[PDB]
Write an enzyme that holds these catalytic residues in place. Sequence first.
Site, PDB file in Angstrom:
ATOM      1  CG  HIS B 477       6.151   6.790 -12.002  1.00 50.25           C
ATOM      2  ND1 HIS B 477       5.583   7.240 -13.561  1.00 50.25           N
ATOM      3  CD2 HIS B 477       5.728   5.649 -11.896  1.00 50.25           C
ATOM      4  CE1 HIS B 477       4.726   6.589 -13.805  1.00 50.25           C
ATOM      5  NE2 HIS B 477       4.979   5.347 -12.904  1.00 50.25           N
TER       6      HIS B 477
HETATM    7  C1  FAD Z   1      -1.448   4.010  -8.351  1.00 50.68           C
HETATM    8  C2  FAD Z   1       0.094   3.991  -8.661  1.00 50.68           C
HETATM    9  C3  FAD Z   1       0.376   3.111  -9.762  1.00 50.68           C
HETATM   10  C4  FAD Z   1       1.636   2.861 -10.217  1.00 50.68           C
HETATM   11  N1  FAD Z   1       1.900   2.335 -11.390  1.00 50.68           N
HETATM   12  C5  FAD Z   1       3.041   2.138 -11.586  1.00 50.68           C
HETATM   13  C6  FAD Z   1       3.502   1.424 -12.804  1.00 50.68           C
HETATM   14  O1  FAD Z   1       2.679   1.057 -13.621  1.00 50.68           O
HETATM   15  N2  FAD Z   1       4.828   1.143 -13.012  1.00 50.68           N
HETATM   16  C7  FAD Z   1       5.746   1.568 -12.406  1.00 50.68           C
HETATM   17  O2  FAD Z   1       7.038   1.254 -12.672  1.00 50.68           O
HETATM   18  N3  FAD Z   1       5.647   2.243 -11.048  1.00 50.68           N
HETATM   19  C8  FAD Z   1       4.402   2.484 -10.836  1.00 50.68           C
HETATM   20  N4  FAD Z   1       4.006   3.063  -9.629  1.00 50.68           N
HETATM   21  C9  FAD Z   1       5.025   3.574  -8.796  1.00 50.68           C
HETATM   22  C10 FAD Z   1       5.402   2.569  -7.897  1.00 50.68           C
HETATM   23  O3  FAD Z   1       4.352   2.367  -6.876  1.00 50.68           O
HETATM   24  C11 FAD Z   1       6.745   3.005  -6.947  1.00 50.68           C
HETATM   25  O4  FAD Z   1       7.718   3.465  -7.820  1.00 50.68           O
HETATM   26  C12 FAD Z   1       7.260   1.907  -6.329  1.00 50.68           C
HETATM   27  O5  FAD Z   1       6.509   1.456  -5.420  1.00 50.68           O
HETATM   28  C13 FAD Z   1       8.666   2.044  -5.798  1.00 50.68           C
HETATM   29  O6  FAD Z   1       8.829   2.610  -4.226  1.00 50.68           O
HETATM   30  P1  FAD Z   1       9.894   2.338  -3.127  1.00 50.68           P
HETATM   31  O7  FAD Z   1      10.046   0.801  -3.346  1.00 50.68           O
HETATM   32  O8  FAD Z   1      10.914   3.243  -3.656  1.00 50.68           O
HETATM   33  O9  FAD Z   1       9.135   2.672  -1.949  1.00 50.68           O
HETATM   34  P2  FAD Z   1       7.673   2.544  -1.610  1.00 50.68           P
HETATM   35  O10 FAD Z   1       7.200   0.923  -1.702  1.00 50.68           O
HETATM   36  O11 FAD Z   1       6.688   3.631  -2.055  1.00 50.68           O
HETATM   37  O12 FAD Z   1       7.662   2.476   0.106  1.00 50.68           O
HETATM   38  C14 FAD Z   1       8.900   1.801   0.884  1.00 50.68           C
HETATM   39  C15 FAD Z   1       8.451   1.460   2.399  1.00 50.68           C
HETATM   40  O13 FAD Z   1       9.145   2.694   3.000  1.00 50.68           O
HETATM   41  C16 FAD Z   1       8.558   2.691   4.242  1.00 50.68           C
HETATM   42  N5  FAD Z   1       8.983   3.987   4.980  1.00 50.68           N
HETATM   43  C17 FAD Z   1       8.676   5.251   4.553  1.00 50.68           C
HETATM   44  N6  FAD Z   1       9.227   6.144   5.447  1.00 50.68           N
HETATM   45  C18 FAD Z   1       9.937   5.174   6.240  1.00 50.68           C
HETATM   46  C19 FAD Z   1      10.690   5.436   7.624  1.00 50.68           C
HETATM   47  N7  FAD Z   1      10.972   6.563   8.051  1.00 50.68           N
HETATM   48  N8  FAD Z   1      11.201   4.468   8.071  1.00 50.68           N
HETATM   49  C20 FAD Z   1      10.767   3.407   7.991  1.00 50.68           C
HETATM   50  N9  FAD Z   1      10.151   2.858   7.020  1.00 50.68           N
HETATM   51  C21 FAD Z   1       9.537   3.920   6.230  1.00 50.68           C
HETATM   52  C22 FAD Z   1       7.208   2.721   3.708  1.00 50.68           C
HETATM   53  O14 FAD Z   1       6.368   2.481   4.873  1.00 50.68           O
HETATM   54  C23 FAD Z   1       7.170   1.966   2.539  1.00 50.68           C
HETATM   55  O15 FAD Z   1       6.473   0.730   3.042  1.00 50.68           O
HETATM   56  C24 FAD Z   1       2.541   3.382  -9.374  1.00 50.68           C
HETATM   57  C25 FAD Z   1       2.400   4.050  -8.246  1.00 50.68           C
HETATM   58  C26 FAD Z   1       1.003   4.307  -7.698  1.00 50.68           C
HETATM   59  C27 FAD Z   1       0.556   5.126  -6.601  1.00 50.68           C
END
Ligand code: FAD
Lengths: 268, 541, 137
Positions: B477
């Site tokens: 996280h």
């Molecule tokens: C094993 C595991 C278990 C988890 N379990 C939980 C849970 O039980 N509960 C919970 O609340 N959270 C959990 N999490 C955390 C959760 O996965 C993340 O908090 C969630 O994905 C939010 O990420 P985000 O949407 O901000 O970005 P992400 O989904 O991580 O990434 C968004 C996108 O940004 C893109 N990106 C990056 N850099 C660039 C760039 N320069 N240009 C264009 N695109 C780019 C990437 O390709 C990616 O697809 C877990 C994580 C892991 C690894």
Amino acid sequence: PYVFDHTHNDDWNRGRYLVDELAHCGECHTPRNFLLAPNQSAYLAGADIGSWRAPNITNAPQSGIGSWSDQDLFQYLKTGKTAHARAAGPMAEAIEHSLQYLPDADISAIVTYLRSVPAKAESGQTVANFEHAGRPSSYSVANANSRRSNSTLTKTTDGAALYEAVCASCHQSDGKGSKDGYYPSLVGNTTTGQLNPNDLIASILYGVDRTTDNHEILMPAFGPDSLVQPLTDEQIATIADYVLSHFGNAQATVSADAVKQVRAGGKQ
Amino acid sequence: SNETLSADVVIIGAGICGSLLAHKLVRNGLSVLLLDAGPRRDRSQIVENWRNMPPDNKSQYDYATPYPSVPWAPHTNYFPDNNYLIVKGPDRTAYKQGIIKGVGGTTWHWAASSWRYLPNDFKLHSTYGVGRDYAMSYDELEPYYYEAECEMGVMGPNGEEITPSAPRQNPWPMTSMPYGYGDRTFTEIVSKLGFSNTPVPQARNSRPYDGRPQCCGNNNCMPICPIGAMYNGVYAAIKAEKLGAKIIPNAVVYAMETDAKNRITAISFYDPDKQSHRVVAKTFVIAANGIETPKLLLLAANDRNPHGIANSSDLVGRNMMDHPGIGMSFQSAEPIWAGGGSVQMSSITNFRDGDFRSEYAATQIGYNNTAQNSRAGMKALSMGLVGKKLDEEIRRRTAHGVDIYANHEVLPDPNNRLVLSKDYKDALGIPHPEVTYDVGEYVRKSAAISRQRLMDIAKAMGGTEIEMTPYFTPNNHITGGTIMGHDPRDSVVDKWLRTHDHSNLFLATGATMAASGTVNSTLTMAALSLRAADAILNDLK
Amino acid sequence: NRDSISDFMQLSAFATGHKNLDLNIGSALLLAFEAQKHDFSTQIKALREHITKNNYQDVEALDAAMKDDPLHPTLIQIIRAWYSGVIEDETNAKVYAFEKALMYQPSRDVVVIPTYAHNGPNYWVSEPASVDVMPAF
Ligand SMILES: Cc1cc2nc3c(=O)[nH]c(=O)nc-3n(C[C@H](O)[C@H](O)[C@H](O)COP(=O)(O)OP(=O)(O)OC[C@H]3O[C@@H](n4cnc5c(N)ncnc54)[C@H](O)[C@@H]3O)c2cc1C
Ligand code: HEC
Ligand code: HEC
Ligand code: F3S
């Protein structure tokens, strides 16, 4: 107004009234004679409705539901769930809106009338749609090792591999479903056992959604609009071919064109 | 590359935050261009990859190998450490975070524990004198919490009373599905220790929901659900693309342009062949997660913004936060039979709040419900047993194997910093992210008690072969790198997730969160993304 | 070509203690073993000859008597290949069996093999079977 055929008991007449007038089974189980009128030559002999196909439900032992046990027919009409058949699409909607609320006596009357419907056999029919035994799985775990470091299913063209990846969690690798019966056995299934694979393709394209006794049972859709795993027409055709050749009717074939036509609401 | 690829709103990152924001925006009539650096991923292919992953990578929790890492947008892999995310500092092991790059992002392989933060979590400094306050209160995020729960299909303990728990205005969209044997047994065991084991709110289908199947306990939420019974961020991307949003995978955003008013006028992204495309939009959002959002902000440094985009306060990449975890593994005296239901079904929420938070970190202690059959099999095989003894050992170790964790709240520390690596670059020449991490005396004091609590749990279970990690573990996280606040000199974004420096730029990420909290943070990130969607809709309409 | 797989299958049934072994998995494992070790067929024959000459009744007696024999590592490697589904100990190692690997069978009656459903959605409400009752396989 229904006419009471006095040469039959009250149960038969009530079943006929329910089938023909109230629940109008022939409205989608009897083929329209291309005049948009029911064909009296083929009553309850199966028809195409949009993307789905209502099968033959005459007393034919092989083509229809003649070999169905009375208990299985009653259970299917009341709940849509049976070890050999699960109601999906229009049948699921018909059961969850009209039939599930019918009294036990009414469904028994429907079964009694159905047992008296004259049989309408089909050309390529030798065993019943639920009487196709299973073949051993041809999936190879080792052969999947080359497909690691792939992010999509594009290079997974094997039917067994596609069935295992997309479909073998709920239904098992042998296609016999779960022990408790929630996930139906694809072996011995009427949908996979039909010579017409329409309902199979539709089942893959749209999944299953039936709500009986306020309990919802759902197979996710796997068509282009799928949230779980979108599949192309070629991939759906390959999975359906594997299912037919291993778990169902082996004389039925699915092409990508057939899946495309089912996606387009069938013949127009 | 010649085309300028215009849209009303362009969202960098197609994870849960970016996809949810795009879905909300296209639902309201805005043209949306959704860019992701990673490729499109198919759930069934990831399932096949995980099935063909070696059993040692299943026993230990390899959550990245099933997702192939693309050279132009590499994500973290740790079984062979691919050295993408560089970690330094005394607690480097605690920031070896797992991320997945692609349409759907890291939510592809999360555990779907969808948690609401406590009202005091948003006002941590005003309540306990530590950390920082959120720019908004819990009551302001409550409607967005509920909207995220309804879209993601969260199931929760509707009829139960949990003393530390966010007050809800509405019940959970679904009720929590019944415990497996392991969770029932763990709850009964830890109830005698004074620990309240309560159901974890999960973006999982206890009944058929959103046209998706009910959870059948595949027990593989991490790293892939084969049937889509849980929420994945790719659902929102699919729904947005169905409503007209344009999704461009393999679009690695690397440059940003600003005008005389410091408003973002365009962005530049690379394709896998390092060809530059210049997207122009009315509104720019970065939803790239708490590591790649600050990394992009620092990499996109301009002449107007020499220290990085939206980095006038020098806080971009600082205050990096997570939940430092302590893991324990042992063999229970009595069978626990892990594997019934989801991988995370319940947790001890008794220590999520209290006056002690003015001194040491509040913690969440939980039991891992992942099936222990791969771990048991590998251990018994390494023991050199054959015949019936091998089978008996496998069965006993899969019945008795227990994994326990204790996660802590870390305070936002400016020296817990993400910077661009000066020694490592990817295939596109973009520097790798390098995080210096220290859990701090807050987390250390909390862990002094958390370790004792974990040992008490192991003792109550008659645990043998007790193995507690001597280091802090990452819980994936990533928060705090783009902290929110009211003062532009002490924060990057405001209460609406809009950057102070650029009125045009929104940052829909967990990096905006001012406090890590005690539980998983993604539901708060989703609610913040929906709030930012409301702000963007107000801006453009 | 056919004797080698028959010998490997019989020796595998002896070593794992389980007669019901997949022939395709066995063929893939034999091919991988023969790639890794060129003499693997000779070692299979030596193990079979040791079993037949001393009339070992199960893999327990053979493993007890083979403690210092150089053929013992191959026996343990065969057992590991059938139980874990892999031959090498890397991350890129080829998996020749999941869900039919013998190390998931002692707990199949209770514990789910993860990406395959044990049964329908809320089965875990039931009480698990005893640890002391080994499923037959
Ligand atoms: C094993 C595991 C278990 C988890 N379990 C939980 C849970 O039980 N509960 C919970 O609340 N959270 C959990 N999490 C955390 C959760 O996965 C993340 O908090 C969630 O994905 C939010 O990420 P985000 O949407 O901000 O970005 P992400 O989904 O991580 O990434 C968004 C996108 O940004 C893109 N990106 C990056 N850099 C660039 C760039 N320069 N240009 C264009 N695109 C780019 C990437 O390709 C990616 O697809 C877990 C994580 C892991 C690894
Ligand atoms: C149109 C809406 C229908 C009405 C009215 C009735 N049925 Fe039906 N039925 C319909 C379809 C599209 C299907 C196929 C289901 C599938 O998932 O593909 C069915 C199925 C049946 C069956 C099962 C036959 C088999 O699968 O081999 C039976 C026995 C059956 N239907 C009987 C039946 C009766 C007795 C009806 C009147 C109450 C009736 N159906 C109405 C479509 C429609
Ligand atoms: C779990 C989420 C499933 C996956 C993955 C697949 N199927 Fe399925 N299927 C599932 C259910 C719960 C049901 C029926 C509901 C019931 O009444 O219990 C089905 C139904 C089918 C059918 C129709 C059976 C009938 O109408 O008699 C077919 C032909 C079928 N499923 C095939 C199928 C294939 C080929 C799949 C791989 C793509 C697949 N299913 C996945 C549950 C689940
Ligand atoms: S893998 Fe899927 S079926 Fe349930 S236990 Fe996790 S959401």
